[PDB]
Scaffold this active site. Structure first.
Site, PDB file in Angstrom:
ATOM      1  N   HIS B  85      34.524  35.050  17.080  1.00 30.78           N
ATOM      2  CA  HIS B  85      34.592  36.410  18.490  1.00 30.78           C
ATOM      3  C   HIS B  85      36.233  36.722  17.660  1.00 30.78           C
ATOM      4  O   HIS B  85      36.208  38.119  18.102  1.00 30.78           O
ATOM      5  CB  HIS B  85      34.843  35.455  19.505  1.00 30.78           C
ATOM      6  N   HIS B 253      24.677  29.037  15.752  1.00 26.88           N
ATOM      7  CA  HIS B 253      23.396  28.831  16.970  1.00 26.88           C
ATOM      8  C   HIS B 253      23.107  27.282  16.693  1.00 26.88           C
ATOM      9  O   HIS B 253      22.519  26.321  16.991  1.00 26.88           O
ATOM     10  CB  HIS B 253      23.158  29.544  17.661  1.00 26.88           C
TER      11      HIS B 253
HETATM   12  C1  HEB Z   1      28.268  32.482  12.730  1.00 22.06           C
HETATM   13  C2  HEB Z   1      28.762  32.830  14.079  1.00 22.06           C
HETATM   14  C3  HEB Z   1      27.894  32.609  15.014  1.00 22.06           C
HETATM   15  C4  HEB Z   1      27.033  34.669  15.860  1.00 22.06           C
HETATM   16  C5  HEB Z   1      26.708  35.445  14.520  1.00 22.06           C
HETATM   17  C6  HEB Z   1      26.998  34.275  16.932  1.00 22.06           C
HETATM   18  C7  HEB Z   1      26.042  35.678  17.291  1.00 22.06           C
HETATM   19  C8  HEB Z   1      25.990  35.830  19.149  1.00 22.06           C
HETATM   20  N1  HEB Z   1      26.510  34.783  19.650  1.00 22.06           N
HETATM   21 FE1  HEB Z   1      26.603  32.984  19.464  1.00 22.06          FE
HETATM   22  N2  HEB Z   1      28.045  30.853  19.204  1.00 22.06           N
HETATM   23  C9  HEB Z   1      28.065  30.599  18.409  1.00 22.06           C
HETATM   24  C10 HEB Z   1      28.297  30.843  16.847  1.00 22.06           C
HETATM   25  C11 HEB Z   1      27.862  32.521  16.924  1.00 22.06           C
HETATM   26  N3  HEB Z   1      27.043  32.900  17.293  1.00 22.06           N
HETATM   27  C12 HEB Z   1      29.276  29.092  18.306  1.00 22.06           C
HETATM   28  C13 HEB Z   1      28.917  28.325  17.148  1.00 22.06           C
HETATM   29  C14 HEB Z   1      28.562  28.744  19.552  1.00 22.06           C
HETATM   30  C15 HEB Z   1      28.826  27.547  20.546  1.00 22.06           C
HETATM   31  C16 HEB Z   1      30.526  27.257  21.352  1.00 22.06           C
HETATM   32  C17 HEB Z   1      30.554  26.062  21.874  1.00 22.06           C
HETATM   33  O1  HEB Z   1      29.571  24.901  21.132  1.00 22.06           O
HETATM   34  O2  HEB Z   1      31.113  25.343  22.587  1.00 22.06           O
HETATM   35  C18 HEB Z   1      28.164  30.071  20.064  1.00 22.06           C
HETATM   36  C19 HEB Z   1      27.684  30.289  21.920  1.00 22.06           C
HETATM   37  C20 HEB Z   1      27.156  31.387  22.438  1.00 22.06           C
HETATM   38  C21 HEB Z   1      26.835  31.241  24.087  1.00 22.06           C
HETATM   39  C22 HEB Z   1      27.121  30.672  24.705  1.00 22.06           C
HETATM   40  C23 HEB Z   1      28.651  30.535  25.306  1.00 22.06           C
HETATM   41  C24 HEB Z   1      29.171  29.007  26.168  1.00 22.06           C
HETATM   42  O3  HEB Z   1      30.097  28.394  25.816  1.00 22.06           O
HETATM   43  O4  HEB Z   1      28.620  29.771  27.409  1.00 22.06           O
HETATM   44  C25 HEB Z   1      26.430  32.926  24.593  1.00 22.06           C
HETATM   45  C26 HEB Z   1      25.936  34.010  25.368  1.00 22.06           C
HETATM   46  C27 HEB Z   1      26.919  33.512  22.480  1.00 22.06           C
HETATM   47  C28 HEB Z   1      25.732  34.848  22.219  1.00 22.06           C
HETATM   48  C29 HEB Z   1      25.518  35.333  21.319  1.00 22.06           C
HETATM   49  C30 HEB Z   1      25.387  36.179  21.072  1.00 22.06           C
HETATM   50  C31 HEB Z   1      24.296  37.696  21.713  1.00 22.06           C
HETATM   51  C32 HEB Z   1      24.967  36.804  19.852  1.00 22.06           C
HETATM   52  C33 HEB Z   1      24.682  37.418  18.942  1.00 22.06           C
HETATM   53  C34 HEB Z   1      23.557  37.985  17.856  1.00 22.06           C
HETATM   54  N4  HEB Z   1      26.369  32.313  21.807  1.00 22.06           N
END
Ligand code: HEB
Ligand code: HEB
Ligand code: NA
Ligand code: NA
Ligand code: NA
Ligand code: NA
Ligand code: NA
Ligand code: NA
EC number: 1.11.1.21
Lengths: 710, 710
Positions: B85, B253
């Site tokens: 982020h 993921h």
């Molecule tokens: C390289 C790396 C990376 C990338 C490019 C991403 C890209 C994304 N993503 Fe992520 N995620 C992640 C790594 C990531 N991812 C992790 C490691 C987690 C875990 C957190 C915990 O386990 O606490 C998440 C978590 C997450 C959640 C849940 C939050 C809570 O705790 O409830 C959602 C709705 C999302 C969406 C998303 C979307 C719509 C996109 C566009 C494709 N994701």
């Protein structure tokens, strides 16, 4: 089509508008300042050819320019209004506003409706400023212009000081009022009036964008007696009494005129909203002639005296010896015109002297006749013009210097030698004594660290940068009314003073020097206890001021009825405590980092008003550690509201109360910018840096009002 | 009841919202900075016990705390999201956003809805930061945390660099979008979409407060194919292609989960609006349990893999080998759950491993299956996990370093030796040659002052501080695509390069050094002509970069399609020219005074694109005077609009056109803060100071990208 937050609406302020405004602590910093770091205005203005300046500035008074020509070929009426308006922003409650910064040449002040066409006056002074350069601030120049105008038109001004350093952007810290629009009536949402039409309490003007009162009457409804009341209230809040108020008004309106001979709706946007074509000016009329006799400024029209280019006794002659009635200026404003004036008494036209125009009085002028008190004074000035001229010159002087601070800041040839009482005068104090001896005696006394530090803080915390009143110099803390201020804890203060007054007697150093020096000792002791040896810098020379030179009533306004630095709140104000803390620190001239270290220190030195434990997150009270930040910042505790301005700091494991704390304390672990600072100082590697930084800040505050040195 | 502008709504911004935001030039200045003036982060992080840090940071991954406990006792999913982020704010158009400042720990980013509960992740890293202190920025720490999480969960990360200096307040210059509310649908007033649902062009997120796309689908309406499109668009605008985009998503993921097992309306205000009791955290549930299995974050609920605390090939196994359908999380969000999963494949509960919960995919995950292109890549990663793991580690690395600039800024033991092309690599250049000889040869050539200065400015003006791309180092101006950029005036550029390429050949100094050095000569010549002898400081060492190491497409984004400093506008943009000027100067890292002097100089050196005369207020073009300010500031002229971005400067007497000027030019005599600066420089006493100041500023810009030295 681009990514920069390139206009001003684009910020964090529109998501979290109740957020603390920490930017007010970071104004006027290296990057907005175009000057070199060594540039010092005070020594430069000292080299200024004042006499040549006087000459030039006088010549300008009758050097009409064709793009905004001078009434009767005399710019003096206009320049007086400049300086009047520049200064009449001052308000005593917090010292903010004033001519002391040259603030009128930036927003918002440059675009207030009351300042219509003073953009022209400033611009007219540019070539003089251009000539004298760095040796003459716009602040000083703007402040002088009306005084020279007075001189040239025949008034014996009482004097002038230079020394006002220019600034380079608007004074962000000044709250001008709640209103979201210009000159709205007081019967509106966002109104500055509450209760029996009582004015909201820092404010010194009747609405947003006016200097003091509405010249067409209360909310534009003429009634001299209601106006009288607003004038008394407002001018008192700019530190002028009845006498001075009558004098200023009569004295101002003795020269110059009201402009309103056209249609105000043809005028363009005010400067901050005009386009670039307007050369940073505003209120330009492009539809018709907006200049000379066609000038629309306030929208009233006429002059108050038959001879508006000269000092004379016309004002009261016209006001008192004629009868007056309501009429409408050409632009539609309420004004008073006299009944059956003689021809000879009519001011002539501004462009051609063979034409007679009209007289006027504003509702504020009529107030000087109809209010009973104002009436008697008006009578006195009409019978005794020597006295009127002398009361006026003095008040003009106080008007334009009210915010300049102690005489030590005053520079130049026309500085009056009189110590005026509003200059809060303090004698130079003895500098040849043995500092170390005083320390040893303070140390030798039975006085606790916290007795010493609290007393010294309280002597100093009165300082305010807005008008350079207060501070530890003069030791007024020992005098009425200060010594009895509840915030100052009189018994404790009494106790300490007995002691320090003795050391001062024995050493020939001022109580003032001794008080600060004792603060320094308590700090040195607390740092010693943490195993740090420091010797805090120290500057001698403070004087003790006499009660005679201490105006008791003027100091009411500096009473600390709140102080976050000692967890003090005298009552339960509408403003949150942290906002109150921010106000004070801004007045002290402190930065946010500086505010942070002070709170941390004072807390562990055990300096809370009432010896309360709120925020004392140490086992070793009296010892100068970073423990306040260390414990603040620790997630082994959870924080629980426990009523008004009060929280319990509870161990997550045992669910037991470990300490208590106020909002002042916890805002430093809540606000994301302040917690960043706190976190820094709670770092394992920053114990020395905390101490070096507290000390620096302590020191900045103890030397804040020491203008006698620099 | 007091006078301080103590909350943030109270300013000049609400009267004149179209006003230039000059504060963006004055950020991060001495008074917000709590560090000493000598503190240098680069040498301090060099002394850091990295190996010990790695150890600590790993241990934290399984050191669950009771106030926000770790899922399955592994904080790694959470810390990855932190860093993801932190970095996923980056946008290529202007380089703004990124993990390079540690911006997430202040407004607004700390309180965006997409960053729900990352306040907890940051807080969890505090004790490590507390331990390593000044040697470890929050910026670096936040940036590292997810990479160590990857390592601990079994991914071979490709590496890491330190060197990100913390800041002390929000980056005021970043425009996040037009919206006045959080995550509003794109069918609203203040919408960032225009035309065929095309995204408003700097922006790289689908709405205000999201990182990239809406996980419940376009405006919360699931449709993988519409989501696919937003993902392609957004991730491209953060410089990631299809391959990298699939990899990042699958890779992210592969571990962790979605939290949404509760009622989102029971959650408290986000951090900037929570009260002080919340310790600077947010989204606290005080009504019920908001933690462990009761945690509500995004409001979707389930994990993507059967083993979310480890790197494995679960993501594609689940995505590709099961069939999926829409369902509602407990908190009411759209999500995909697989049809007939086997028990063994169900992620267990976060608190008690004897309980099975559910799998999920977001609309963005389903896009990886349903989009045809994404599909093929998903297939490739499912068949070839070595390749998936290596494409992912690289992109993770580019994700988190995209904005760190040239390798010269990279510090620490795990810096990869490979020069990645997105690092815009430049070899060290020769430093032993005779500077004065080069000057004499440049001087000896037939090249005008303005030929020299324009070419050098244009080499340098590409710099941008947001992600530390561009600048004069590497001399990419001679390479495609730059040498053909209309802004760069190719024929003139060609002409000059022929010459300077020769001098460089003969001297063994880089074309880069020669180009800057020639700029310096032209300046020195113009100053000479005004009777000032100066020798501009100069630093050698620049390299020439190869076309091979110059990614042509990545540089599109640095094309100057506007430049106030040379009165250049390629087209007729919505933004006013002065806003465009402010953007660029902010990127250059310049202050408002600096911006002012540059415009004055360049104008009189005669450097306008197209040799246009707009703003050249001199009789002596080629001579370095303060004449631009002197004539700008003079009321003998009046200014008349004359079409698009164009004004006539007319003598008031003769009513004749004396010069022409653009808005870029005249904003400096219109804006009240800029005219203050201009006025200063038009003072009779400031001719030297103008020159010393222009020179300083010129110099700051020529050395902006010289990280190989400091
Ligand atoms: C390289 C790396 C990376 C990338 C490019 C991403 C890209 C994304 N993503 Fe992520 N995620 C992640 C790594 C990531 N991812 C992790 C490691 C987690 C875990 C957190 C915990 O386990 O606490 C998440 C978590 C997450 C959640 C849940 C939050 C809570 O705790 O409830 C959602 C709705 C999302 C969406 C998303 C979307 C719509 C996109 C566009 C494709 N994701
Ligand atoms: C000191 C001084 C002073 C003072 C205090 C004042 C005070 C006053 N004021 Fe014054 N004003 C004046 C001085 C003054 N003033 C002058 C000088 C003028 C003139 C301007 C010309 O002339 O331009 C005026 C002007 C004026 C006007 C007109 C403007 C135009 O132009 O239009 C009005 C409305 C006024 C009001 C007033 C009021 C309401 C008050 C309260 C009382 N005024
Ligand atoms: Na003031
Ligand atoms: Na008169
Ligand atoms: Na007459
Ligand atoms: Na950036
Ligand atoms: Na997994
Ligand atoms: Na299982």
């Amino acid at each position: 089509m681009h990514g920069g937050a390139t206009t001003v609406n684009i910020s964090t302020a529109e998501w979290w508008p109740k957020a603390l405004n920490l930017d007010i602590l970071s104004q006027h910093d290296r990057k907005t300042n175009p000057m070199g770091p060594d540039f010092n205005y005070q020594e430069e203005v000292k080299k200024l050819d004042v006499a040549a300046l006087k000459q030039d500035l006088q010549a300008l008074m009758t050097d009409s320019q064709d793009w905004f020509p001078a009434d009767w070929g005399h710019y003096g009426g206009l320049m007086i209004r400049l300086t009047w308006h520049a200064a009449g922003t001052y308000r005593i409650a917090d010292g903010r506003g004033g001519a002391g910064t040259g603030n009128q040449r930036f927003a918002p002040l440059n675009s207030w409706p009351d300042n219509t066409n003073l953009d022209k006056a400033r611009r007219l002074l540019w070539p003089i400023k251009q000539k004298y350069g760095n040796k003459l601030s716009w602040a000083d120049l703007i402040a002088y212009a009306g005084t020279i105008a007075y001189e040239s038109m025949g008034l014996k001004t009482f004097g002038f000081a230079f020394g006002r350093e220019d600034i380079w952007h608007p004074e962000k810290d000044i709250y001008w009022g709640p209103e979201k629009e210009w000159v709205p009536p007081s019967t509106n949402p966002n109104s500055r009036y509450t209760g029996d039409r009582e004015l909201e309490n820092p404010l010194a003007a009747v609405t947003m964008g006016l200097i003091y009162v509405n010249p067409e009457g209360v909310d534009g409804n003429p009634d001299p007696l209601k106006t009288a009341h607003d004038v008394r209230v407002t001018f008192a809040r700019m530190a002028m009494n009845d006498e001075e108020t009558v004098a200023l008004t009569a004295g101002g309106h003795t020269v110059g005129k009201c402009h309103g001979n056209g249609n105000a709706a043809l005028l363009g946007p005010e400067p901050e909203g005009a386009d670039v074509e307007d050369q940073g000016l505003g209120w330009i009329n492009k539809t018709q002639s907006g200049i000379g006799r066609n000038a629309v400024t306030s929208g009233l029209e006429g002059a108050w005296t038959p001879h508006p280019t000269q000092w004379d006794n016309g004002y009261f002659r016209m006001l008192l010896n004629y009868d007056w009635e309501l009429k409408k200026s050409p632009a539609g404003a309420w004004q008073w015109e006299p009944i059956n004036p003689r021809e000879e008494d009519l001011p002539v036209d501004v462009e051609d002297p063979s034409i007679r125009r009209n007289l006027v009085m504003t509702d504020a002028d009529m107030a000087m006749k109809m209010d009973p008190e104002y009436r008697k004074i008006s009578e006195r000035f009409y019978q005794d013009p020597a006295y009127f001229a002398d009361v006026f010159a003095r008040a003009w002087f106080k008007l334009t210097h009210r915010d300049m601070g102690p005489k030590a800041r005053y520079i130049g040839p026309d500085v009056p030698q009189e110590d005026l009482i509003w200059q809060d005068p303090i004698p130079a104090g003895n500098r040849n004594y043995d500092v170390q001896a005083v320390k040893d005696r303070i140390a030798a006394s039975g006085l606790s660290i916290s007795e010493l530090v609290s007393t010294a803080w309280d002597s100093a915390r009165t300082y305010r940068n807005s008008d350079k009143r207060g501070g530890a110099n003069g030791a007024r803390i020992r005098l009425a009314p200060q010594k009895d201020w509840e915030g100052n804890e009189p018994d404790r203060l009494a106790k300490v003073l007995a002691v320090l007054e003795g050391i001062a007697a024995a050493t020939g150093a001022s109580v003032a020097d001794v008080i600060v020096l004792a603060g320094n000792v308590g700090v040195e002791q607390a740092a010693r206890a943490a195993g740090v040896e420091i010797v805090l810098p120290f500057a001698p020379g403070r004087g003790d001021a006499t009660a005679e030179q201490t105006d008791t009533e003027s100091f009411a306004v500096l009473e600390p009825i709140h102080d976050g630095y000692r967890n003090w709140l005298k009552q339960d104000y509408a403003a949150t405590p942290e906002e109150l803390l921010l106000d004070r620190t801004q007045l002290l001239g402190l930065t946010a980092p500086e505010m942070t270290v002070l709170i941390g220190g004072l807390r562990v030195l055990g300096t809370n008003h009432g010896g309360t434990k709120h925020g004392v997150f140490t086992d070793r009270e009296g010892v100068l550690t970073n423990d306040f930040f260390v414990n603040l910042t620790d997630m082994n505790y959870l924080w629980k509201p426990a009523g008004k301005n009060l929280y319990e700091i509870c161990d997550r494991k045992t669910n037991q109360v470990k300490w208590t704390a106020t909002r002042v304390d916890l805002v430093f672990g809540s606000n994301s910018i302040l917690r960043a600072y706190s976190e820094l100082y709670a770092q394992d590697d920053n114990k020395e840096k905390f101490v070096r930084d507290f000390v620096a800040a302590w020191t900045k505050v103890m030397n804040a009002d020491r203008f006698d040195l620099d």
